[PDB]
DNA sequence: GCTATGAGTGGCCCCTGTGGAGAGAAGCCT
DNA sequence: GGGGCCACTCATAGC
RNA sequence: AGGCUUCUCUCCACAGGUUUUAGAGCUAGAAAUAGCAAGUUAAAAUAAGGCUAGUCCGUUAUCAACUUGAAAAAGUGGCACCGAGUCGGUGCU
């Protein structure tokens, strides 16, 4: 017969539960055939088990490294551009110069030219390293000198600047010329007093210079200034200007009594023209003061980093670094003298041992700055004359390096200034530099805009750029090849979610005029009013709706029901008393866009004509899409013909954010077949029907729901990957979803394809309903006689606290730490409870004590980075992997620790010994991930390359990670890699022991009635003998399968060493002890006070004579292979 | 007599620090 | 967290 | 409707780190070694490379075994009963 049955499911972060139950709450056991070459020709198993797999990983690392790769490629491109520019002139001075630079990383033997990269003779190298100890001295030389310079040195300077061109946080142009804060602040005071001599603010008594110098919050510095500034406050004009210079965004209308509201941020780029915007209102006199404020802002911003170079030069950064170097040398000499004078013994320790964290480790070792300061500080405290050094160390300025993490704040404008100064000074002697100043400067300043995206030629799945001319994109001609305009549209449109009712349609901007119309009219649909004499509330008439909208909504930005009752019914309809329902004291909808556009354009008839609707909608869309004004101006240029220049300029300034939820072709695109009206038209006037959006979509009287039904055609059957990709949540749970789907498919395959009646599901931490919907779509595919689905399979969602309280009430405790059966038991209880809401407890106990549970470790082909990235120094081994195809690791060192893609069993002959004699062998060979393509290209070739001979192709068995092997006495192992094995057996602890362990674990944390607590305490106290039984069972299981004789002896000694402790402590230490036999990699643990190192099974020989297992996703189908009989010696 | 093998056994090692722009969600508050 | 690698020590097989 | 925080996806940039090489160590001493001197920077790579040859792409996800397929994809293993330490036995077919 067709046994009525249902399948329970448990979906988690790392595992999937599966179980089959009858209506009688039993668990049937069935017999399954075995394929392969074994003799165990039939196996019977319970229809319950749990699946395991690794956690899915977010894409974040992949995205990071993709972006990094692109940055590196573009940096190399910039160097190549500079070298192409220099090439022809460089050919005359030194032909091999760029060759020397390229091959500089090879050893003396490998190089094709002279070994000194720069000059090719050692004498000039020493001269260069004497005259310029660091590159910054050369940069200063080229900044200041009027003498003709060697072309090679200038190339070095320019390349150094380009390859580290710094950040682009600041827009505009910073002026390092305004080096000193104090005099600029005095100029600000003078200009402020000239503007306001009636109420001067005293400069004396204000410590602006130091406070601006002192490292404090911008709000903190502003507060300190207000305390110092007499008769002044933050929102006051002078304090507002100071905050503007600091970086706060103050509004300026209150100071000048302006209708316009302008919150300017000086650093922000829009400030540069919005300043002229505001000065157009407030007159020209206020302009120069804002200029001085900008100067003060630049002064403080740069002085925070340049460390106040009083030396009058155009390139502060080089001077600052050179000053730091000089102070470093001075302090080094002084420290050497003092330490040699007072503590002769530690000289070698501090200054020779690379392993220490002293100066030797700080320079020739790997010690950072902080560790060196930490080591050196106490020594200074034991000596004399260390006052200055300790003060400097409190500044973090002792013996400082030059290439450190501080430079992460240097703005690129400084590098640009030095570049320009060089190109100006040296142009007189070198003509070709003069022609290329623009190009070189652009190379530094240019970058691909964030919204354009990668410059790909179609064949890149991440690209959206549109290319006009087939010229190669180069920074000099970027503008003429790609369109910034058309590009940006595509960049934005990738994300705007499609309309639900019309999946092929894009949603409109939230601030669309059509959107405002829709919201206003629809909210008016369900408004009812009661006047005297009216027995029932009346729907507002379409004529009334139109008149009210025209009179109030197009005249008032925010309208209350009070205004309606006072203005329309009262004044026009002569109803003094009206009772209105459906709106709470004000309309939620508002025609804000209408008022703004009428404010700017000032043509009401233009806004009132439907013939202009497309124009307005396009305008709103454009004003929402972009954020750079220039492209908006480009797009608005289409409508400059109907509008004057000032109106056009005002439009280019408003901005909107947010998107709507409905599509144009929905609200005003689809028409009713009967009348030709749109949803908007029906809302505006629908007779006595006065239907809302919900009514208009769910009513069959109009063809709208027909079109929507026609619109939601089921998409073409996608691969499971894209079904996974659409959902919302952590991708691991999506992995679990796919696993559960395949589990259901395979289980239906098992039961003779007779579909189950019910499905009970639970989920770990909406998407649950999505999983249920996917399952129901897969299962129920019968449409009834009326094209309605027949629900032969019901899917019910249940919550975890249900089963939790079900366990706690009937005392079927779970302990996650004893084994992995708990997933299967939770799934089975899920199914049973779900069926229950649609012998029993004896059956529950009988099932839960079953030792046979189907646990399968899902095999995985490891993918990811080829190996570790921390490049290691050279050393004599064959276990390092070259960084390039031609860089022998012995000479150059390189990578280490590859990750094995998988392993294949090898049966061949090998030349062994000094005599090169053939021995027939059979072992595991691991394919590295980096070699996967080569091996799957032609395995025979790759194997022959490894030295194996007479390769027998058919013998190759493909063994992923967590391949499973069978050994004597049921001992099992999982293949972690080619050389390490993990435990493959489970400790089956009977039910009563588990319950006792739970009770003892919470012995002082049990929660229940006090009578229940006393019952459970007494039950624990009665069965104290359980301690030794559990200990001995662990011992016996270890002796059979784990083989941890040293560890087992240590554990047994520890248990005897502490046998006299209370129950709860002993139980907690028991919980720790289960780690020894858990499935997976061995893990160390603490038992009372003794640490047990993890035992690693570091040999894989014993499986070469074992029986291999291949399991279905639940293992109900098995194909066992005996490896002993193939390739016998 | 000597060398080579591998088989443990213990112990150590693993790239990091940011900023900007955008879209969606989700959770909290008003 | 868990696998790769090294230093050490050493029984063991081989010769 | 609005404000703040957190999460996912994509793009743009920055600063380091590492590696090797270059930056003539000197003296005494056959050497071991001892003494002294100096110590802050630079070039290149930053998953091997691939072909569609782009200022593109390479660490996400998907894959037990057998037959049919380039792959997506398709097909491939009996039933009931009594028992239970990784599952056993009995009967029909």
PDB file of N, CA and C in Angstrom, chain A residues 39 234 285 317 426-427 441 481 533 703 730 1054:
ATOM      1  N   UNK A  39      31.558  -7.785  -0.562  1.00  0.00           N
ATOM      2  CA  UNK A  39      30.694  -8.933  -0.323  1.00  0.00           C
ATOM      3  C   UNK A  39      29.450  -8.584   0.483  1.00  0.00           C
ATOM      4  N   UNK A 234      28.755  80.219  19.267  1.00  0.00           N
ATOM      5  CA  UNK A 234      28.945  79.378  18.086  1.00  0.00           C
ATOM      6  C   UNK A 234      28.054  79.807  16.928  1.00  0.00           C
ATOM      7  N   UNK A 285      30.730  92.520  -0.472  1.00  0.00           N
ATOM      8  CA  UNK A 285      31.649  92.890   0.602  1.00  0.00           C
ATOM      9  C   UNK A 285      32.055  91.687   1.448  1.00  0.00           C
ATOM     10  N   UNK A 317      56.943  69.067   2.645  1.00  0.00           N
ATOM     11  CA  UNK A 317      56.953  67.675   3.085  1.00  0.00           C
ATOM     12  C   UNK A 317      58.371  67.120   3.138  1.00  0.00           C
ATOM     13  N   UNK A 426      62.914  72.599 -14.107  1.00  0.00           N
ATOM     14  CA  UNK A 426      63.794  71.881 -15.020  1.00  0.00           C
ATOM     15  C   UNK A 426      63.362  71.963 -16.478  1.00  0.00           C
ATOM     16  N   UNK A 427      62.285  72.688 -16.784  1.00  0.00           N
ATOM     17  CA  UNK A 427      61.786  72.720 -18.154  1.00  0.00           C
ATOM     18  C   UNK A 427      62.705  73.507 -19.074  1.00  0.00           C
ATOM     19  N   UNK A 441      50.902  65.977 -15.209  1.00  0.00           N
ATOM     20  CA  UNK A 441      50.051  66.385 -14.098  1.00  0.00           C
ATOM     21  C   UNK A 441      48.725  65.641 -14.122  1.00  0.00           C
ATOM     22  N   UNK A 481      36.102  59.503 -25.306  1.00  0.00           N
ATOM     23  CA  UNK A 481      35.789  58.121 -25.646  1.00  0.00           C
ATOM     24  C   UNK A 481      34.550  57.592 -24.936  1.00  0.00           C
ATOM     25  N   UNK A 533     -28.015  66.366   8.091  1.00  0.00           N
ATOM     26  CA  UNK A 533     -28.975  65.824   7.159  1.00  0.00           C
ATOM     27  C   UNK A 533     -28.513  64.583   6.423  1.00  0.00           C
ATOM     28  N   UNK A 703      -9.852  44.636 -16.177  1.00  0.00           N
ATOM     29  CA  UNK A 703      -8.851  43.730 -16.722  1.00  0.00           C
ATOM     30  C   UNK A 703      -7.478  43.896 -16.084  1.00  0.00           C
ATOM     31  N   UNK A 730      22.088  35.763   5.173  1.00  0.00           N
ATOM     32  CA  UNK A 730      23.453  35.268   5.112  1.00  0.00           C
ATOM     33  C   UNK A 730      23.542  34.082   4.150  1.00  0.00           C
ATOM     34  N   UNK A1054      43.989  12.022  35.601  1.00  0.00           N
ATOM     35  CA  UNK A1054      43.337  13.258  36.023  1.00  0.00           C
ATOM     36  C   UNK A1054      42.021  12.977  36.736  1.00  0.00           C
TER      37      UNK A1054
END
